[PDB]
Amino acid sequence: ELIKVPTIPHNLVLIQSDNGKHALIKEDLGQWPVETGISLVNQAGVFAVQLANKLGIDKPFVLDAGSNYFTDTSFIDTRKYCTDGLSPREIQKALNRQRAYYDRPELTISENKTLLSQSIIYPDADGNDVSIIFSGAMSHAIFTYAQSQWNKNIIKLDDYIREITLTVPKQYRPRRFKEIEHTHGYVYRELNQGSLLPLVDANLKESSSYYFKKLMSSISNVPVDHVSMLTNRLTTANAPTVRAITVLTCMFKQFRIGMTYALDPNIMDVAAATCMLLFRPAQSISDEQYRYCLQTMAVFLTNTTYDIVNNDTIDVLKMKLRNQGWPFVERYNAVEIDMSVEPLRSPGQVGRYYNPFNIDPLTKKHVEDRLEEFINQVQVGRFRNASGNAVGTTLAAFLRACRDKTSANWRGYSVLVSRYRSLIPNELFESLRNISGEYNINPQDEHSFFFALAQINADDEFIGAIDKESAEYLDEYATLARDISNSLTLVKAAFGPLERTSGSIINHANNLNKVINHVFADKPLISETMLKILTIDGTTGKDGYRNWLDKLVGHNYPVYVEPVVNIMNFISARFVADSSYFGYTNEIMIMPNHINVPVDDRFGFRDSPFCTSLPRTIMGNDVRRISYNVFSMMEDIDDVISEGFILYDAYFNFSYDIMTTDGVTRLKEDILIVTDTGNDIKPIHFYIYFENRNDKKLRYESKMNVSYRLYIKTPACLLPLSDYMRAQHDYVSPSSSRVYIKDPAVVYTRS
Amino acid sequence: VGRYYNPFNIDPLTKKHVEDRLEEFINQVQVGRFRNASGNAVGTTLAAFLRACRDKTSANWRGYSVLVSRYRSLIPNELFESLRNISGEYNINPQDEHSFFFALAQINADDEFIGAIDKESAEYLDEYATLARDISNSLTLVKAAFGPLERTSGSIINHANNLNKVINHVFADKPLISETMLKILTIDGTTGKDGYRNWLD
Amino acid sequence: YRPRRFKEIEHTHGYVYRELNQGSLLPLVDANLKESSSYYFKKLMSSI
Amino acid sequence: KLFETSPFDPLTIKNNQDVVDKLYATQSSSIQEVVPTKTFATELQFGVTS
Structure with a gap:
């Protein structure tokens, strides 16, 4: 059944200083821990499902946001004002306070009207309603892509009937749909049929015995x-x-x-x-x-x-x-x-x-x-x-x-x-x-x-009994086809070819058990129907699945890429590509305080730890780059850290909270910990304050109390308040005239 | 390999x-x-x-x-x-x-496997290095304490069995010597008198 | 791989006793192992 | 431990016949390639006595 989403997830928060001088907009997609030394794509897939669940795009859905609007009191204005996304009133207040600090005239009535009318809903030619709201870039990209994938399986009722018209016999009474269903009816169905051959060929004796x-x-x-x-x-x-x-x-x-x-x-x-x-x-x-x-x-x-x-x-x-x-x-x-x-x-x-x-x-x-x-x-x-x-x-x-x-x-x-x-x-x-x-x-x-x-x-009685069997057989075949697709994807991603060496055999056996123990825990991935097919010979269902999976390694069976697989592949790709959105980075820089490094001055932070890009050269010479493994193993770290370096070849998880007051920007913990076994970097947490530019006490504290500083690339989630037009994004909601049919059957059961 | x-x-x-x-x-x-x-x-x-x-x-x-x-x-x-x-x-x-x-x-x-490492098999194989050191130490000590050996009377089986008892008495402070020598005799002695002769060699 | 460092005093005035004789297993296995193989197995x- | 049960304790043997008798006694502990049972004889002759 289709899920009808009422509101759009924007994930936007406005942070402004008490003085009002500086304000910014941030996307809050959360913090996701990344472990170094193992594959990043494999971890991204796990986080992709959680992100999809957070945004509400895991299950098939359509957007109903065309009713989320109001109308202004002016008689000339007949526009619709969307209530989704970050409210334009919040941006007006943030801009309003900024002008108060600078002793500037307040926003005019005409300027207020333009800003407060930025979020609008208007209809297109096809009857859909498009909403223009203030929302984050990553959320908009993921949400819109999910809409495209799900809408592929939403077709007109007359289009569905044409697909299945050759499977309807002549002994069943035709079903009369209402006139509204015939003009505005839509159904969500998956029209791709999966072959049962991979299971039948692998186990011919068991599959034949079950059906016979x-x-x-x-x-x-x-x-x-x-x-x-x-x-x-x-x-x-x-x-x-x-x-x-x-x-x-x-x-x-x-x-x-x-x-x-x-x-x-x-x-x-x-x-x-x-x-x-x-x-x-x-x-x-x-x-x-x-x-x-x-x-x-x-x-x-x-x-x-x-x-x-x-x-x-x-x-x-x-x-x-x-x-x-x-x-x-x-x-x-x-x-x-x-x-x-x-x-x-x-x-x-x-x-x-x-x-x-x-x-x-x-x-x-x-x-x-x-x-x-x-x-x-x-x-x-x-x-x-x-x-x-x-x-x-x-x-x-x-x-x-x-x-x-x-x-x-x-x-x-x-x-x-x-x-x-x-x-x-x-x-x-x-x-x-x-x-x-x-x-x-x-x-x-x-x-x-x-x-x-x-x-x-x-x-x-016999005719009625057979009709019940037909429904049971249809469900059984559909369930088997899904589990075959799930099994084929699992084998391709998790297994490789074998070699005539003890190491390869040991590696394959251990991996096979780890997969089998995982897929049978909690709710099993595999349905009870195929477990019955594989158990028919007396073996345990868990053992039968292990045997079948081993046979399937190296198959050339074509597997259709379903919409849910496309959605997670999109989220996984953007997880790797845009790491700053999700709270991790692949490069940090440690420098002494007396070395002046160019930083991002857009946000007005005091001693901002964010650089637009980590500098290639400092003071006319290239910055040293050391990998984490070599850095951990170093015994002369005191000499190296005196000149400053760049750490890479690892996934650094960082957090920060922006404080509206003014203070000394610093870290929660020390940068590094030195042990007789190795050196490590303590968890990173930034306390960031806005700067008054004229406080002698805080200028002295920052220069003398803190001796070393940590720099990372500027997170892409942050965006200055002046560039609020960059958060303006569109969303398309299908027409409200459509009716979705739960049971698209075309005939009744009677002679 | x-x-x-x-x-x-x-x-x-x-x-x-x-x-x-x-x-x-x-x-x-x-x-x-x-x-x-x-x-x-x-x-x-x-x-x-x-x-x-x-x-x-x-x-x-x-x-x-x-x-x-x-x-x-x-x-x-x-x-x-x-x-x-x-x-x-x-x-x-x-x-x-x-x-x-x-x-x-x-x-x-x-x-039994931690990653690709079998701990029990690794530790068990390492104990042969300790046994190898013990065998070499015990053989050298017996050769030093007991020089060239002669048998004026008695059998080869009795010559080797009684020599082990004296080794136990002479080296009572270090019982490892007698234990190691009897380990070799157990393997060699399954063939009989010819096995005992090989032990003396 | 490298060994872990000791205390400061042990690295300045430290002395250890060690023996370098690895030994051999040949005397134990230089025999007719036909009879004893079944017990070893x-x-x-x-x-x- | 090379053996869980030693084939024979060398201090208790006095001659060759002692080894064979002990090896027959402790053969159950070993992995026998043939497991003993009753023997089958295909030749037997009795000589005249005094």
């Missing part, structure tokens, strides 16, 4: 409405399980199924083998299973042994069976039916599914046009004996019962396959495979399934 | 098994027929066990690779070159070998 |  078991639990709940050996073995105990396998074979591509026969085949095993080859897709039967089925029929019908046909090829087995009089030696490809709509999570793609029982939808019969002729062949065949025709007649009668059952019930099963197929995306259709053979069919269950085929009843 | 075979035949660069056809090979076993001409579960059972062994091996090779590195860090150089002269064959029961791989235990040493 | 696995 989920689908079977749903399908198994669908409502439905020599001869002695065949007739004594019928059981409908596992018919719901066989039914789910049938739907799975047709809804997927290459879902291999397997049957295991007994050591000594009988008429039931031959019946099951024939039913498998006749009424199941060829895409779901492997070559080895095809050979096993041919061998089983050859063993029984020809009265041979498994040893004789163990070395026989497919063509040889077909020749042997055809000579005896058995024509059922072929497997048949199923006929693919195209889905009426584009499948979910498959943009610009066409989905397809096999028609059950190898029934051609055009002819509404079996794909084998010789089926009736073949059954007559079996009925007049002499198998396993010299005469009697007991086996042929029994198999002919059993085959005819299966043929009528499949012809009557093909429409019902085709509807079931089509509805469950719409649940899975195209990537899962083409990638998931049956590994470990964790679903198999007993030969008795197969021939009982086709002899006692049950019609499919689609009650209102 | 040393070398060691990576555990479980895994290449760190590839992060997989050395054989590049393992996935194809396992699927071949699953759809195969073994030990019978008729159908059986031999192919499927072996495929399931092979997959579990492969998955554990890829999951836990990092911990065992670190373990070998830590163990070798404890061995000084002179000891390692001496141990390279010996050889042996270890016999493992088939039940133990399969149970070890099927029930592989994850090994973690994150708490 | 058991201690090695017990160190970690």
Whole structure:
């Protein structure tokens, strides 16, 4: 849901002396500690999220500031006066006091009116309202950039409908939006689809097992409405399980199924083998299973042994069976039916599914046009004996019962396959495979399934249950895609390549544990859905994630850069680039008091510790530069510090408070501490006072009491009061006529 | 500087098994027929066990690779070159070998490492320098106190055993000498009379 | 790396006693280590 | 410590047979490449006695 921000964060404070001579404006973005010796960008990212939270730009938002205005009492003035930002009255008072010190005339009525009308709200052509207010530079830059990133995912409702119009079926009642929604409706949606392939490819067995078991639990709940050996073995105990396998074979591509026969085949095993080859897709039967089925029929019908046909090829087995009089030696490809709509999570793609029982939808019969002729062949065949025709007649009668059952019930099963197929995306259709053979069919269950085929009843309860599953599947896929993106970003930033050295292996293992322990603390980064996928093999979810992350190192998978990543990258870059805004610097200078160094005189400070830039040369000679590590290790620091130097190669955190009175500008603590181990710089805190230029006591105190001074570059947050026009910044707020739709669904759930 | 075979035949660069056809090979076993001409579960059972062994091996090779590195860090150089002269064959029961791989235990040493430094291994290896100084000091003192040694009567085993007792008595103020000499005799004496002769040499 | 400094008096009138003999481990390991290796290995696995 | 349990205390051995007997006694503490059990004999002959 979009957040509607009422006010603009300006972060401006006005500091003025008691005399009124000097005033300044400061941005207060806070103090952020920086540690030396480690990467600055890595610390910047952590501080970027906190800064975004402070400014209120972490979550998607729009600005509602067009109602924050008033109107002047003058009849000529019809302008709108914005109430956001630093108030122009405060600047007027600060300027008012400054003129009092200088014995100058007060601000005139015309000059007052110009100043008090600097903050205005006016509308543009598009209907948006732009507010011109006094605000800090860094806050304006970050806030405006965040607006640009979030507005990319705000589109008109009619634009959203066009994107998803190819995924809406024809069994759902269209939703009538109100007239206001159609003209002024807007929705915030992310339209980028993330691939589930990285997780599926890395763990094919676990991903396949998870989805296969989920689908079977749903399908198994669908409502439905020599001869002695065949007739004594019928059981409908596992018919719901066989039914789910049938739907799975047709809804997927290459879902291999397997049957295991007994050591000594009988008429039931031959019946099951024939039913498998006749009424199941060829895409779901492997070559080895095809050979096993041919061998089983050859063993029984020809009265041979498994040893004789163990070395026989497919063509040889077909020749042997055809000579005896058995024509059922072929497997048949199923006929693919195209889905009426584009499948979910498959943009610009066409989905397809096999028609059950190898029934051609055009002819509404079996794909084998010789089926009736073949059954007559079996009925007049002499198998396993010299005469009697007991086996042929029994198999002919059993085959005819299966043929009528499949012809009557093909429409019902085709509807079931089509509805469950719409649940899975195209990537899962083409990638998931049956590994470990964790679903198999007993030969008795197969021939009982086709002899006692049950019609499919689609009650209102079943339709409602499936619609609930569709919502659950959509959320599950969306959650998985997000966690894949999060994992891919984490691996790229935190891991590198491996080497055949002990140090590299030790380094990788320690880093992997540190990452894993961090991502599972507090609220886990990874969702419970994928933890279920990785735990399905019995391993701990924490261990499974560690294994998956290691596999992902060095991937070339493309990851879409989302708006939140763009926002933090902007804040991180400005954190490094403009360090003075955030209270740290990379260079300080220590000089004796008798050395005159040029400083920043804009603010009227007494002995200002701020220089516009640290001088390159002092007294005609370049200033010495020493790194912090060498400085810490020095033993002759007394001799070096007598001439003054510049310290760099470290991140110096500093603080200051500007006092309105007049006094001796100094530091809270001493500059350095000398120990037998090394020398360090104590925490830096400046007490800055404004100067009266004629106080002899304070002039003497500054020259004689303090002997050494510390100089840093002038912080960019400070800005003299005279340059208050530099804080004038613009902000655009979208029109108030827009309506944001929380539920952008286009159809209802009813037949 | 040393070398060691990576555990479980895994290449760190590839992060997989050395054989590049393992996935194809396992699927071949699953759809195969073994030990019978008729159908059986031999192919499927072996495929399931092979997959579990492969998955554990890829999951836990990092911990065992670190373990070998830590163990070798404890061995000084002179000891390692001496141990390279010996050889042996270890016999493992088939039940133990399969149970070890099927029930592989994850090994973690994150708490043992401070950054990239293993404190316990560093201090343990440093103690060999103290032992090296003690060995040299003890041998020189015995040679000075007891000059060339002669055996007019008795056995070599009795000659060396009784000499150690006199060393303990003569150097009772410094018990380290006898302790160090008995350490060398313990290693040498496992071979018997020939080992005792080497100690005297 | 450098050593930490001592007191002022210790750096002017300071004296220490030291021995430079590093020694060697060869006498301990110059033997037929076949029989004793198994016992050494058991201690090695017990160190970690 | 080179050994957690010494193979044999040298002061207690008097001859070669003493070393082998002690080594057999303390072999459980070592990492045996073969773990002993009952022995299998494939040859046995009995000579005539007095």
